[PDB]
Structures are given as structure tokens and as C-alpha cells.
Amino acid sequence: CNGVAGFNCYFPLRSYSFRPTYGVGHQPYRVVVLSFELLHAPATVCGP
Amino acid sequence: CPFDEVFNATRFASVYAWNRKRISNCVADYSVLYNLAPFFTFKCYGVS
């Protein structure tokens, strides 16, 4: 595709274009994932 | 299954009489949908 757009040459990114008007199942959601590792170690972090 | 006669058609239909076709019980080859010409628009929504 020599770095140019065309058939079978698609740019692998897409946009959302959120507007306050879409339905309840289409608005953006904010997601955070917490990962632990419960093993044997100096145990740097834990609670009160 | 035939996509030739729906694309290589001499006479087409008006916008208010848009032509209908149903296709079932066949094998669809969507690769030979490439040489319709140099430059055409190919956009699909829902699937890659």
C-alpha cells in the first residue's frame, strides 16, 4: 500500500464520537483494573 | 451463488423503486467484488 490509503489498505484506528444524545447503552464508561500478587515477599503494601 | 447479475445489470431501478433481492442456501465469495472498477467506496458497519 506504499503508506497510502486505498482498498485493502485501512488505517487501524477508529473514533467514538460521543454525544449526550445516544442511548443508555452507548455512553462512555470509565474502567480501572487492580491486579494483585498474593505470594511470599517482604509484603510492601497492606491495610489498616 | 449469483452476484454477477445483480452487479453486471444493464438496467437498474429507481430510488423510489429500489430493487430487492434475497440470497440463501449458497456460498458467498466476497473477493471477486474487487474489479468493479478503479476507485469505489466500500464501507461496512457492524463487522470488520
UniProtKB/Swiss-Prot annotation, chain B:
Intrachain disulfide bonds: 1-26
Glycosylation positions in this chain: 8
Self-association state and partner proteins as the record states: Binds to host ACE2. RBD also interacts with the N-linked glycan on 'Asn-90' of ACE2. Cleavage of S generates a polybasic C-terminal sequence on S1 that binds to host Neuropilin-1 (NRP1) and Neuropilin-2 (NRP2) receptors. Interacts with host integrin alpha-5/beta-1 (ITGA5:ITGB1) and with ACE2 in complex with integrin alpha-5/beta-1 (ITGA5:ITGB1). May interact via cytoplasmic c-terminus with M protein. May interact (via N-terminus) with host bilirubin and biliverdin, thereby preventing antibody binding to the SARS-CoV-2 spike NTD via an allosteric mechanism.
Function, as annotated: Attaches the virion to the cell membrane by interacting with host receptor, initiating the infection. The major receptor is host ACE2. When S2/S2' has been cleaved, binding to the receptor triggers direct fusion at the cell membrane. When S2/S2' has not been cleaved, binding to the receptor results in internalization of the virus by endocytosis using host TFRC and GRM2 and leading to fusion of the virion membrane with the host endosomal membrane. Alternatively, may use NRP1/NRP2 and integrin as entry receptors.
Protein known as: Spike protein S1
Range of the intact protein held here: 336 to 383 of 1273
